Amino acid sequence: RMYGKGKGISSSTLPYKRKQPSWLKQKPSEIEDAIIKLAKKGQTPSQIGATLRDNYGIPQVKSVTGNKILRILRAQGIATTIPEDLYFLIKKAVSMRKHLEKNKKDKDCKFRLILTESKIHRISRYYKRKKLLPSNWKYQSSTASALIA
Amino acid sequence: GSGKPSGLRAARKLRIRRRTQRWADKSYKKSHLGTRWKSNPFRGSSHAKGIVVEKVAIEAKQPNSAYRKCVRVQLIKNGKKITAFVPGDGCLNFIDENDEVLVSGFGRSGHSVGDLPGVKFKVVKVARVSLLALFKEKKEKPRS
Amino acid sequence: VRMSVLADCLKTINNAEKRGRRQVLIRPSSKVVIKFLQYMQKKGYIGSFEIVDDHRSGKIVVNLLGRINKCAVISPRYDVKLDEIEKIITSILPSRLFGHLILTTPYGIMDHEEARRKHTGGKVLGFFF
RNA sequence: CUUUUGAUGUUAGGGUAUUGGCCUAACAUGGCUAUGACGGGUAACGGGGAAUUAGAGUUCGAUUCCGGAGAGGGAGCCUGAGAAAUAGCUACCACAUCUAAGGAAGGCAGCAGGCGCGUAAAUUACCCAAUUCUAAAGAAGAGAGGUAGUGACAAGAAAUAACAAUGCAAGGUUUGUAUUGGAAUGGUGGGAAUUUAAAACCUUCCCAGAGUAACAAUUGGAGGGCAAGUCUGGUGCCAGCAGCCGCGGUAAUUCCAGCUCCAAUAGCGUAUAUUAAAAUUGUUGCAGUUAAAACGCUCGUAGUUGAAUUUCAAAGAAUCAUUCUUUUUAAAAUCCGAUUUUGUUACUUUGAGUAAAUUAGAGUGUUCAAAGCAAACAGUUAAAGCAUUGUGUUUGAAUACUAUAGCAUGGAAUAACAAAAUUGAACAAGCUAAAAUUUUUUGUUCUUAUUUUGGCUUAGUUACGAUUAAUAGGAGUAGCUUGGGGACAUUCGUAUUCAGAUGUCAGAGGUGAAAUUCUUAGAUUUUCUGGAGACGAACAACUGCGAAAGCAUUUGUCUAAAAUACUUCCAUUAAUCAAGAACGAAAGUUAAGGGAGUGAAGACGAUCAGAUACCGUCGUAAUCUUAACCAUAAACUAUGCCGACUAGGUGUUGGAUGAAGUGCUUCCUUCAGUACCUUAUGAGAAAUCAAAGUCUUUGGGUUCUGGGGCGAGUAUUCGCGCAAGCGAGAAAGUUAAAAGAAUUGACGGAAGGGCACCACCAGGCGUGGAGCUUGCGGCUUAAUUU
RNA sequence: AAAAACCGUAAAUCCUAUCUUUUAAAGGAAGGAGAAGUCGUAACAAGGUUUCCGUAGGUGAACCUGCGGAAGGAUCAU
RNA sequence: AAUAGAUCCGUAACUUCGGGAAAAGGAUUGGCUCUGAGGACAUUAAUGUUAACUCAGAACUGAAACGGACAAGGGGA
C-alpha cells in the first residue's frame, strides 16, 4: 500500500479462459455500440465495465472484442482528456480543500490532502511522461475546482 | 537488506560514507588533523634538543609510591616548556641545571607512560653524552 | 517490491532444501531462473522441475534431491573479466574440486569452469554447492 | 559563484608563428554549480614507481628517468632558429663587497667549502681514461661525468676454529665432555704481478706470520605476554623498574649488583612515523533491543533500485560409458534452384600503441649471493667448417604488465534507450513535378520533343499493425461495512465549588501522631434551588482507530481512511529517500477569555541535629478555550521502510464463503489486523527473539546512525526562535578501563517460611541502687613488666 | 646620439578595507589531576520519598517540587 | 578651520531586520570638436518631414584646472 500500512490483497482475478465464453452468442459490434452509448450518457470507463458486466452479462470486454474498453473509447474519439484515476484524485483533493477552507483546524484533513496531492503529482508526472497529457499540464491548486471541466 | 547500498551504480554513496566515517576513529583523526603540528612540542620530530631549566620530583600514581626525578626543558626549536623523565637510578645528579639535553618520546607517542603523570618525554643524552653510556657502565667518558 | 526474482527463487529453494521438503514451489518464474534451474539440473543438484503456466507469469515446482547444501544469488551482478574468475571463485566457492559459480556471458548462462573452457567471462549471477 | 575592471557568446578588427576575449569596439545575457561550483587547507611539483600486501586494500613518491617550474623577490628587455636566459642586461625591494667618499661591482636551489638552522646529512681531493656534449669537430675543453676520500643509509657473502688420544658421563665397544699436540687458515706486516689517466681497492704469487688462536662479540633481557633463575648479596614504598598487567613496606623469581641462562648476532637496542595485526573504517567485510549507534513521525526531489513477456529448437563425426565438433529452421534486398547483410550502448573477447629503470619472468656457476648482461666452444698452439690459399665459430640480450579513458574487433546471455494508435503503415494501379537516353530548329551560337527512372495526389490489396494483467501499484463500485480517525455545532451526567435557603448544635479538617486552618456571627453535617468551570468513572479489555503525537457523554453535519468482495478501469504508473515540507505529548512564551479542582513559586504548621524536602493548611503562574509561537520527551516494541521464505496451537477484531440449532444464531474455510503459548540439528555473549531466523555456507532493495571512557552535546561560528532554547558542533588536556549479559556469595527501613530462655511469651532470680574484694581503661609513674 | 611626450608592460612604496595565523590581559567561568580537608546522603536494597526522561520554577550542595511520559520496577496475574 | 553639489564605486560593529548609512572611505567634474542611444507624423515589406533635453563614450586643449564665484554634512570609538 502506497501510504499507511496493510497489504490488503483483495482484488479480482481473471479466469484462465482468455477467449469469449462459449455460451455468449452476443456480437462485438453491438457490444461496442452499447459501450459508446453508455459512455455518451456519461460514465467513467471503470463503471462502464461494471454496468456492462452486471446488466449486460458480458464479462471481460477484452474477451468479447479483442481490445480494451478505454482503447475503443479513444478510437471513437470520445475519451476524456484527463484519465479516470487522475480525475478522481483531483476531485477528492478539491472536495477536501473546500472542506479545509471552512475548517482549517482539521489537521488530519490537511495531512490527507497533502498525501492526495502527492499522489496527484506522481500520477500526473507519469501521465505526461506518456504523451496522453499535455506537457504544460501542472495542476496548480487554485483552478483545480473548475479543472474538472 | 544490509544497511548499505549495493547497487552497481552506487559507488558515490559508499565512497562518501566511508570518507565521512573515517573521521570517527581516534587514529585517523590524530594522523590527519593538522592540529598535531601546533599541539605537540616536537612538531612531528622524533627527538628535540633543549636547555634544562630545573630538576623536579614528581609523585607516582596512587597504587605506587615514588618520587620520579624529572627535569623541565626549554626547547630550542620553539622555546616550549616540557617535562622529561630522566631514566636510570642515579642519573638525576649527573645532569646540570643549565646543561643542554637531547630528549625523545616516552614510547607511547603523546600518552603518559606508567605511574608517571603528564610526562611524555625522556632524556637520552646530556652534554652530547649518552645517559646509557654514562650510567649503565662508564664505558663512555664522564661528563665533559 | 520483488526487485530480483532470481534472488527470491534461490532463497526459497535454499530454505526448502534445509527443511528437506523434497518439493518446492517458486512463484515468480522467468527465463533467467529457468536457465539457472536447468543448469543446476544438468550439474545434477536438483531433479526434474516442472513449470506451471498460467497467464500470469507462471510458477515452477522443483523436485529436490536433498543434495544441494547452499544456493544463492550474487547482487549486484558484477561484471567479471576472464582474468579474475580464479580471483572470485577462491573467495566464493567452498573448494575448487566441487561447487559452481554461475556466470551470465555473451554466449549464455554457464559456470566458471566452462566459462574458462570457452573464454569470455561475463557478469556474475550466483552460485550453488 | 562569474559578469563595471572579459564573465559566456556573436560580428568586425588588432596582435601573434598560428587558433583563441589573447586584446579592442559594437551587440546579446550569458557561463559554472549538491555529480560539490566558488572558496579554505595541504608539513601537495605530477607520473614511471616504493613499503606493506592471501585477496581486497592502506600509506608513501624532495630524491637515478620523463614532464613542469625557479635561479634572493617581482617586473622589463637585447641578441638569437631557439631565452622573457639569470655563472645575459635594465630597474625597484631586501641583503651585501671595494672605495682615495668621486664612484664601481654581486647573486653557490652548479662542484667543493663556510655560517646559520636544526634530531637530521661527506673532500675547499684527482682526471677527462670510460659515457657523452660543444667547437673552426682525432689532438681542446667539460666540478657534465668518471675515480678515490668520509660513510654501521640501506643490501649481499662471510671469521672469532677444526681434528686424534687418554680421563669423565651416557650406550652394547657408539656419542658428548678436561688434558695434552701436531696440521689447516685467514686477519696483519713486507714485496711483486695486475688493475688504474695516476693511484688506491679486489684477485693472484713469495716471505714472515695464531694456543688463554689476548688475533678475547656485543646488544637486550630472564614474573606473564615472551625464550630464559622463586640462585646469592645490597636496598626496604626509598632508590628505582615497568610498552601493559604489575614489582618494591626484610626471602624482591621484576630495583641495584655477581654467577648462570635466553634471544638475536657484527650486529643489537631506543624515539617518531607508517603498514599488517584491524572483519577496531568493513566493496569483498563490521555494528545499531539491552555494549557506542534506527531521525518523533509521515510526505518528498536529487540519488540508489526496480515484475513477467518477443527464436524456441532439432539432427550428424571424434576421447571415455559419457564428453566434445559440425549442419538447418521464419521474413526482406544480392546472385540462373543456387550463390548473402539484416538497431544503439553498457558489458565481455580479441588485437594495435604500449619508453626505459623498477616489477614478474626466460637464459647465463659474478668462486655463491646481492649482482651484471653477458658469454660458450675446439685449439702446449692444429683438425674441421667456407674461398676461389686465408678466413675463428655459435650465440643472448627474450616474454608479460603499461589505466578505469581513447582506437579496432567476435558476441547469442544480463542490463538499459529507440521505435510502438483518440492511429501508424507497406504493396499494387492511375495522376502530377525533376533526372537519364535519343532525335533535333539552325547560321563561332538560339529551339524543342520523344521513351525509362528517383518524388505528389488519387481507388484497391496485406495474416496490415496494440504482450500479460504481477498474492506490484493506483483508480472505481458494494455492503441495516468497521472504527474512542479528524473538524464544527449540540446534548447529558455526577462530583466539586460558589450563592441563597433549610434544620440542629460543638466541634470540624488533617495526621503515624499533631499543628497551621474553619467554627455560637452556626463550622462540619442534612435537604432543596440557581450559577460556574472541569472532567467524561463503572462498561473498559495484553480490545478498536490513527503516520506519529494521540483519540472514550448524546445527536447532527462535513471529512478522510482501512479491510473485505469484484470476470470494473489504467497498465509499471513502483520501493527507499540528502535537501525541502506537514504534523508533532507535556512544560514554556505572546494576546484575549476563563478560572471550579489541582497546584512549579511563595507563606505558614509539623518531623529532624538541621529540613530551604518528603507530610498537612493555604496559595500565584499554569492547567481550560481561542489565535499564534516553540519543535523537544524513556516522542519506547530503546527494534527504520519495502519484498520473499520458514511451525504448530490458543484466542480476539473487521469482512467474505459453505453448512447446521432456532425468517433468526453457531460451526467450517479464507483475507486483513492483533496478541499470547510451545518449539527450534535457527539465531544470539546471554537475557531472550517466529524475528533479533533464512550470516565466515557472509551480496533481495534502500535510508539513517556508531567506532574506548571523561572532556562534551562543552567551547566557537552559522541558521532558526519573542525568550527559554533547538538544529549543526570541535579541540587541548586526561584516562585503562568504562560498558553488556549472566553465575556464586554477601547485603536489603524486600516478600514468604523455620528454629532458639546466649529470643520472647507464663513467669521467677538477679546486675546496674549502697558498701567491700578483684580485672581492665585511664591518672605523675627510676618502674607501676606485658 | 642625447632629450621629451603619449598609449602599453609595469616593479616598488604608501593609505584604506577585509581575511588568515600567532599572541598580551584586570576580571569571569569551566574541566582534569592530587592529598587523610569541611558539609551533608543524592544513587545502588522498596537506598529508606521507586528510579529515570522532557520542561519549568526553587534551593549551600548533592538536590526538591509541578505537568506529561517510560519501566531500564518493586507489578508479565480475577 | 576643515568637504560639503552631482555621478560612479565602496560601506563595519550593532540591530527591534525596518535601519545604522550621506557610515567610514575612494575616483571624476572645465572648454571645444565629435560619436552613440532614447520619439512623432504617409505612401505603395520599402521612402520622406520634424521636436525635447537627458544620458553614455572618444579625441583635443590649458601654468593639473574645472560643484572655479554663489551654494554647500566634519567624521569615528
JSON list of C-alpha atoms (C1' of nucleotides) in Angstrom, two decimals, chain D residues 73-76 91-93 585-588 598-602 609-614 632-636 638 711-712 724 734 747-750, chain E residues 9-13 30-33 40-41 45-49 51-60 64-72 76:
[
{"chain": "D", "resi": 73, "resn": "G", "atom": "C1'", "xyz": [61.51, 38.61, -4.57]},
{"chain": "D", "resi": 74, "resn": "G", "atom": "C1'", "xyz": [58.88, 40.93, -8.65]},
{"chain": "D", "resi": 75, "resn": "A", "atom": "C1'", "xyz": [58.81, 43.16, -13.43]},
{"chain": "D", "resi": 76, "resn": "G", "atom": "C1'", "xyz": [61.08, 44.54, -18.24]},
{"chain": "D", "resi": 91, "resn": "A", "atom": "C1'", "xyz": [65.03, 48.99, -12.86]},
{"chain": "D", "resi": 92, "resn": "C", "atom": "C1'", "xyz": [62.69, 48.60, -7.88]},
{"chain": "D", "resi": 93, "resn": "C", "atom": "C1'", "xyz": [62.58, 45.91, -2.71]},
{"chain": "D", "resi": 585, "resn": "A", "atom": "C1'", "xyz": [2.64, 14.86, 24.37]},
{"chain": "D", "resi": 586, "resn": "A", "atom": "C1'", "xyz": [3.87, 17.84, 28.48]},
{"chain": "D", "resi": 587, "resn": "A", "atom": "C1'", "xyz": [6.18, 22.07, 30.02]},
{"chain": "D", "resi": 588, "resn": "G", "atom": "C1'", "xyz": [7.24, 27.03, 28.35]},
{"chain": "D", "resi": 598, "resn": "U", "atom": "C1'", "xyz": [-5.23, 20.52, 41.36]},
{"chain": "D", "resi": 599, "resn": "G", "atom": "C1'", "xyz": [-1.24, 23.39, 42.01]},
{"chain": "D", "resi": 600, "resn": "A", "atom": "C1'", "xyz": [6.22, 24.66, 39.95]},
{"chain": "D", "resi": 601, "resn": "A", "atom": "C1'", "xyz": [6.83, 29.77, 43.13]},
{"chain": "D", "resi": 602, "resn": "G", "atom": "C1'", "xyz": [5.67, 31.52, 47.85]},
{"chain": "D", "resi": 609, "resn": "A", "atom": "C1'", "xyz": [20.68, 17.69, 64.74]},
{"chain": "D", "resi": 610, "resn": "G", "atom": "C1'", "xyz": [19.42, 20.69, 60.53]},
{"chain": "D", "resi": 611, "resn": "A", "atom": "C1'", "xyz": [14.70, 20.02, 56.59]},
{"chain": "D", "resi": 612, "resn": "U", "atom": "C1'", "xyz": [15.03, 25.53, 52.22]},
{"chain": "D", "resi": 613, "resn": "A", "atom": "C1'", "xyz": [12.14, 18.23, 51.45]},
{"chain": "D", "resi": 614, "resn": "C", "atom": "C1'", "xyz": [9.18, 14.15, 51.99]},
{"chain": "D", "resi": 632, "resn": "U", "atom": "C1'", "xyz": [11.52, 18.86, 22.37]},
{"chain": "D", "resi": 633, "resn": "A", "atom": "C1'", "xyz": [10.27, 13.52, 25.80]},
{"chain": "D", "resi": 634, "resn": "A", "atom": "C1'", "xyz": [12.42, 6.65, 28.39]},
{"chain": "D", "resi": 635, "resn": "A", "atom": "C1'", "xyz": [8.45, 11.17, 21.38]},
{"chain": "D", "resi": 636, "resn": "C", "atom": "C1'", "xyz": [9.99, 3.31, 23.61]},
{"chain": "D", "resi": 638, "resn": "A", "atom": "C1'", "xyz": [15.14, 1.60, 23.32]},
{"chain": "D", "resi": 711, "resn": "G", "atom": "C1'", "xyz": [36.37, 16.41, 28.44]},
{"chain": "D", "resi": 712, "resn": "A", "atom": "C1'", "xyz": [31.19, 17.34, 25.92]},
{"chain": "D", "resi": 724, "resn": "A", "atom": "C1'", "xyz": [13.51, 29.72, 27.05]},
{"chain": "D", "resi": 734, "resn": "U", "atom": "C1'", "xyz": [43.15, 13.48, 30.81]},
{"chain": "D", "resi": 747, "resn": "C", "atom": "C1'", "xyz": [23.61, -7.49, 51.98]},
{"chain": "D", "resi": 748, "resn": "G", "atom": "C1'", "xyz": [18.25, -5.15, 51.95]},
{"chain": "D", "resi": 749, "resn": "G", "atom": "C1'", "xyz": [13.97, 0.65, 56.80]},
{"chain": "D", "resi": 750, "resn": "A", "atom": "C1'", "xyz": [12.04, -6.70, 50.30]},
{"chain": "E", "resi": 9, "resn": "U", "atom": "C1'", "xyz": [54.11, 46.32, -19.92]},
{"chain": "E", "resi": 10, "resn": "A", "atom": "C1'", "xyz": [54.59, 47.57, -15.03]},
{"chain": "E", "resi": 11, "resn": "A", "atom": "C1'", "xyz": [58.45, 46.73, -10.28]},
{"chain": "E", "resi": 12, "resn": "A", "atom": "C1'", "xyz": [58.12, 49.35, -5.69]},
{"chain": "E", "resi": 13, "resn": "U", "atom": "C1'", "xyz": [56.15, 52.48, -1.71]},
{"chain": "E", "resi": 30, "resn": "A", "atom": "C1'", "xyz": [34.86, 25.62, 33.35]},
{"chain": "E", "resi": 31, "resn": "G", "atom": "C1'", "xyz": [37.43, 20.85, 33.08]},
{"chain": "E", "resi": 32, "resn": "G", "atom": "C1'", "xyz": [41.18, 17.37, 34.68]},
{"chain": "E", "resi": 33, "resn": "A", "atom": "C1'", "xyz": [44.69, 15.56, 38.43]},
{"chain": "E", "resi": 40, "resn": "G", "atom": "C1'", "xyz": [25.70, 16.83, 54.14]},
{"chain": "E", "resi": 41, "resn": "U", "atom": "C1'", "xyz": [23.33, 11.48, 51.98]},
{"chain": "E", "resi": 45, "resn": "A", "atom": "C1'", "xyz": [18.08, -2.81, 48.72]},
{"chain": "E", "resi": 46, "resn": "A", "atom": "C1'", "xyz": [11.02, -0.52, 48.15]},
{"chain": "E", "resi": 47, "resn": "G", "atom": "C1'", "xyz": [18.64, 3.00, 49.28]},
{"chain": "E", "resi": 48, "resn": "G", "atom": "C1'", "xyz": [14.60, 4.17, 53.49]},
{"chain": "E", "resi": 49, "resn": "U", "atom": "C1'", "xyz": [10.13, 9.94, 49.24]},
{"chain": "E", "resi": 51, "resn": "U", "atom": "C1'", "xyz": [14.33, 5.24, 39.53]},
{"chain": "E", "resi": 52, "resn": "C", "atom": "C1'", "xyz": [14.70, 7.76, 35.04]},
{"chain": "E", "resi": 53, "resn": "C", "atom": "C1'", "xyz": [13.14, 11.31, 30.69]},
{"chain": "E", "resi": 54, "resn": "G", "atom": "C1'", "xyz": [11.43, 16.25, 28.60]},
{"chain": "E", "resi": 55, "resn": "U", "atom": "C1'", "xyz": [10.16, 21.02, 30.53]},
{"chain": "E", "resi": 56, "resn": "A", "atom": "C1'", "xyz": [9.65, 24.90, 34.25]},
{"chain": "E", "resi": 57, "resn": "G", "atom": "C1'", "xyz": [10.50, 27.12, 38.90]},
{"chain": "E", "resi": 58, "resn": "G", "atom": "C1'", "xyz": [13.27, 26.94, 43.63]},
{"chain": "E", "resi": 59, "resn": "U", "atom": "C1'", "xyz": [17.39, 25.77, 46.99]},
{"chain": "E", "resi": 60, "resn": "G", "atom": "C1'", "xyz": [24.59, 25.76, 50.20]},
{"chain": "E", "resi": 64, "resn": "C", "atom": "C1'", "xyz": [13.39, 19.39, 45.75]},
{"chain": "E", "resi": 65, "resn": "U", "atom": "C1'", "xyz": [8.66, 20.33, 43.54]},
{"chain": "E", "resi": 66, "resn": "G", "atom": "C1'", "xyz": [4.75, 20.89, 39.44]},
{"chain": "E", "resi": 67, "resn": "C", "atom": "C1'", "xyz": [2.94, 18.87, 34.46]},
{"chain": "E", "resi": 68, "resn": "G", "atom": "C1'", "xyz": [3.19, 14.90, 30.76]},
{"chain": "E", "resi": 69, "resn": "G", "atom": "C1'", "xyz": [5.76, 10.44, 29.79]},
{"chain": "E", "resi": 70, "resn": "A", "atom": "C1'", "xyz": [8.92, 5.30, 30.34]},
{"chain": "E", "resi": 71, "resn": "A", "atom": "C1'", "xyz": [9.95, 0.51, 33.06]},
{"chain": "E", "resi": 72, "resn": "G", "atom": "C1'", "xyz": [15.62, 0.20, 32.12]},
{"chain": "E", "resi": 76, "resn": "C", "atom": "C1'", "xyz": [4.23, -10.04, 32.93]}
]
